Amino acid sequence: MNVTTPEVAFREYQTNCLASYISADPDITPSNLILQGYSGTGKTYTLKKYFNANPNLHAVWLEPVELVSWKPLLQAIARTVQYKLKTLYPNIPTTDYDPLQVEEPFLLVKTLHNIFVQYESLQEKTCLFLILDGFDSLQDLDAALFNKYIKLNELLPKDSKINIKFIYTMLETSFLQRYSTHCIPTVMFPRYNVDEVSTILVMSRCGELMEDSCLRKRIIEEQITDCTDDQFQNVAANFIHLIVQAFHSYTGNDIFALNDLIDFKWP
Amino acid sequence: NVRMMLRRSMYKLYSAADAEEHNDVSYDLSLVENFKRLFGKDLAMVFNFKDVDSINFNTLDNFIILLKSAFKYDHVKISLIFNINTNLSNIEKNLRQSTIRLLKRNYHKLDVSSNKGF
Amino acid sequence: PVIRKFTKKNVARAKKKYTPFSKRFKSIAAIPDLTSLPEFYGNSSELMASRFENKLKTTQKHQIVETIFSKVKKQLNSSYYLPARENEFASIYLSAYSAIESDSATTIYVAGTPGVGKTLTVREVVKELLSSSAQREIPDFLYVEINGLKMVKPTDCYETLWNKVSGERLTWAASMESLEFYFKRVPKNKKKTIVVLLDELDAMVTKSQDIMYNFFNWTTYENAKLIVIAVANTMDLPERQLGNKITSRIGFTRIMFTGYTHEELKNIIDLRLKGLNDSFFYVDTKTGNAILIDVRKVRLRMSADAIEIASRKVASVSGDARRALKVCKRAAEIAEKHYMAKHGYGYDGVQTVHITHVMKALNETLNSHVITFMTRLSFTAKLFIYALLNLMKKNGSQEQELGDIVDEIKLLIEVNGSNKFVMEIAKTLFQQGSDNISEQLRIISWDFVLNQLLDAGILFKQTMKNDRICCVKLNISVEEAKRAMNEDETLRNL
Amino acid sequence: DPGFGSLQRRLLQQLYGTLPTDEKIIFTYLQDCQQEIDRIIKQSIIQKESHSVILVGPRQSYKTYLLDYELSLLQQSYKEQFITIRLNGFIHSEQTAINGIATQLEQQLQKIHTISSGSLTEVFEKILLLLDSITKITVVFIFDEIDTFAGPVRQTLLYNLFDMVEHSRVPVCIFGCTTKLNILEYLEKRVKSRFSQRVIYMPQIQNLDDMVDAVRNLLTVRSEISPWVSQWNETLEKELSDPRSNLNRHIRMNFETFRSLPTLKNSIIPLVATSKNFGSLCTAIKSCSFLDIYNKNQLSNNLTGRLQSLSDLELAILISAARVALRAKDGSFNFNLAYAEYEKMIKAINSRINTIKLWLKKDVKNVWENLVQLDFFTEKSAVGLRDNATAAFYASNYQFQGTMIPFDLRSYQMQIILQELRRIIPKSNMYYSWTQL
């Protein structure tokens, strides 16, 4: 299938991996897959970048970073599935079930089965994608969780005109090695290096801090009519070069703390 | 723990903002970001940790990390107040600096006592 | 306006009453006769029993295939006369007949190991008691089946007792009170004798035996007539759960059933087979269907010496007729499938089974596949268990950490820098031969095999976070570990 | 050509095992079990046997997949005879399992021609009466991870199912997939008495040629579609025959490291997945140099690369901790002890003689948590992640001494040891002279 590749600067390996993994037709996509990484690598940013590259495919988004346990995920999923279904199929009739009615994965699958049987009159089969950002970052997590979510596609009947898929993102990899016997496809993003993070920053924060107020503030506090966008960018670039040359030993290959410190000390 | 006081805050907010205008929704951080499409009005929260010093600091850190996850809706504001009793430098390093970095952004300081300036 | 702090909507409330029977007549003279009542004494459960018969009926037939052994399997099945265990019949039936003649409240308790035919014998005894009820000379009484394992909550015994003796629905706390009322406050002239069988009490009353305490309180009346029996495995239960005073004051009778003897086992199993024993069958030429007294007329038989040996081996351990019968059935199955494979009919003049195959079916139960599997693993698990045994020989500790066992592993590998097997499995295990791969402190697949052995049960891991100081134990033995070690040609020499 | 793309999809779905029920491939090294189990199932489907059986084998070994394959073989000629039941211990429980059973039984009985209503015990007795009490429709259960139903005390459902197998007239087929080997050990007297006790195991790979012919079969075409079908077949044959090929070496690697096929399936999928044109396909499967990148980036960030990417301050403080741990009894260390040893190291370095700068306590404060969050240190009497719900619940109720006492005086623990680091690091560093106690 024709898939527009996102011409990224540093994550083209994972771009190739995922563009080969996933396409419109569910037949050439794996039953379950993981996208693990580390903070600051922009794994989530690149996921939506690839979605921009491929508009026709769609997915739901959940952020259990705020949710605390399993049942809140159950209610959120039960809400979002039917919300997306009815929003993207306006003409289809429905008997909207209560998302709060879910209190257990058994009830969740029961209501999804009801949704599918009421959606039985589709013209072609369609598989959607689910996203759980920070599934290991939960606050009451235990070791008996991931396998159950892996087991969603099995209890579902095979005659479903509408199916689903799972996405994940971990940080530590300790719990990931705790469960790797099931041979799940996985794509990884190694922590960046000096030049990689430097380029990432000078192409990400460059505009953000170039259209900031303080530049124009100082340009007329000094009252000097000798300037150009090229020289603004050059001075910002060399100041960031100094910042990284000073505090790389402090942090290394991270972006969040550097951005916070820049916001604090730029003025 | 974290979830208990989260439920306290959600129950407070719901039972306070319901009767003022006249179905049930669970107690979670989804409710605050779903306030618009339930009541029609935006919301601004003010928080008051009564005894800031005698609480479990890892639980506090988990709670603040959880609350910093609702700044992506562009329709809500909030504010936190610590009613300190000892000092700022006494406890600003007792808690991990991960929380303290952003807390250096916009703060305010008051000299507080019953005998202010005689 | 109000908000419910927590909701319960999936609840399934049961439509049952709270008012006991004691509050719908309001006077002793205002009570009718329950015998002259259509709803009482279970005259309505028949419609429910017969209402669900047609839910699973169909009429699909296509090229039915029938064979020789299956009829014998059915003849040998447990779903059906016995003279082996008859003295207990003559005793307990005599006691029950005398008890019903006396119209008293007698108590009796029995036990036995699973497979002693206790349930079979009691069911046959009560069936012959049903026949004596068909004599129409003894006072009629109604049976009650009590299967707490098929029941969920132990207190539901009262609920079902009321719902089957009256058809009325209530909760335990009211049903048992109304039953107290129905028992001690009700005279004899119209109340009916009831016989009850309790089953496997060891798990009904795990908490405090309040339910059975209430039962044994019911079984101590002179104005109420009941026949109470129970089944268990242990024997000390009446004095253990209750104590000595209650069990002595009740003064019941005690008995237990023991495993049968080999001769009785063989006699009974052949008794379930005399109809087909040494029978002659007309057999077709294509399907091989065996029809009894293009067609043969052949004979059927089975190894009586195999009966002897099969009964002998298993009569000395437990006496489980279920075990004996399944052994016979599986011997028949293996013989039948081997015979079928001889010709290869497909799917759409002497026949006999041998001592060899009967013992083949009987012995694979005790032959454990664990030995073969653990000898058929990869080299890594065997090497690691051997290292564990080396540490056991070195310290006599009965326990070993993870860091210490890994140290022993590295020492055992590096000491043998000469052996050819370890030489040839050397470089393909850390960085996998080629460059561009940095070394790793641990080998590949160690966590894989560790979780494999954890999931196998031979390895025990305590709850700890440190990957080094976490204690580790082996579960089976050191001798069997050697019986796996030395069958590797390379391990024996090192 | 798009025909080659359709061929790519065809071989990808052959790799998965999602074909019609005539081309789904099974190999001679398991035809024994395949022809055993198809018979074992049809004997209950059409011959009305009530056999009870429990499969046994490790994860990723194609047990439930083979059950599904046999049932899909059966369906084409048997669209009415059987009813399918799929269950799982983790997804279900001792209470919701019966509700799922009732829902399934009611919602597929309509597919050919109430139950779900009532309370817990009420539905229990409904199902009990319906199953306990011309021709009968066969029922097949597919248990998954019966280890959950292998609890210590009650587990009454398994006893009820086996008693139903023995007593009922309907053919009650039971299949059990797990990972434990000795299952019968869990059981009590009753479960052993009721159960047939006949448990089947799975075969293992006994020779390299077995996996070679498995690869051949899984990479052989059985239909003429694309102009390169014969080319693919002959290339696979000729390349796989040669024992010198990198792919045969990786066959050996599977044989000796893991001894399980699905991980190899995962490893091979990306090759064709990223394959674009015929020339790149041929060269990449010839040199197999992209397997180098695959296995380089597969386990890249486990133990080594993470330590390869870090600041020299991290190395210095780690050395300070490691030396004092070796000096110590239990190897315990703290923040300021490591700081003291670090300053001693820098003092010696500047005494032996572009300059060197030491970083204050405030500077070490930020990076200490970066160390502890990268799985290099721990707490002395630590317990990391509880397995189950009750333990996770009590974790949040009772707090820790390490929680309440300040940052820099809680007892820590080490992951790597001095000599391990000494032999691991590049020895050319200026800090190499300071990696030996």
Ligand SMILES: Nc1ncnc2c1ncn2[C@@H]1O[C@H](COP(=O)(O)OP(=O)(O)OP(=O)(O)O)[C@@H](O)[C@H]1O
């Ligand atoms: N290749 C890239 N191109 C552009 N921006 C990038 C790239 N890699 C990383 N980034 C930046 O990295 C930032 C990382 O923030 P993000 O919210 O995506 O967190 P993360 O790495 O997914 O971590 P976590 O899931 O733990 O929050 C992204 O906002 C993006 O701006």
Ligand SMILES: Nc1ncnc2c1ncn2[C@@H]1O[C@H](COP(=O)(O)OP(=O)(O)OP(=O)(O)O)[C@@H](O)[C@H]1O
């Ligand atoms: N004398 C006998 N005659 C015929 N069959 C017998 C005899 N003794 C034992 N059996 C067989 O042995 C089986 C053992 O069943 P039994 O009545 O002992 O079960 P149980 O002890 O109630 O079972 P559980 O402990 O599982 O609840 C009987 O069903 C019957 O098939």
Ligand SMILES: Nc1ncnc2c1ncn2[C@@H]1O[C@H](COP(=O)(O)OP(=O)(O)OP(=O)(O)O)[C@@H](O)[C@H]1O
């Ligand atoms: N519908 C399917 N189509 C293709 N392949 C499948 C399908 N279902 C399962 N598989 C294959 O089954 C293989 C694993 O088999 P299976 O899940 O039965 O293993 P197992 O060891 O019995 O697991 P468990 O005990 O967890 O059920 C996986 O490699 C997957 O490719």
Ligand SMILES: [Mg+2]
């Ligand atoms: Mg992120």
Ligand SMILES: [Mg+2]
């Ligand atoms: Mg019994």
Ligand SMILES: [Mg+2]
């Ligand atoms: Mg399985």
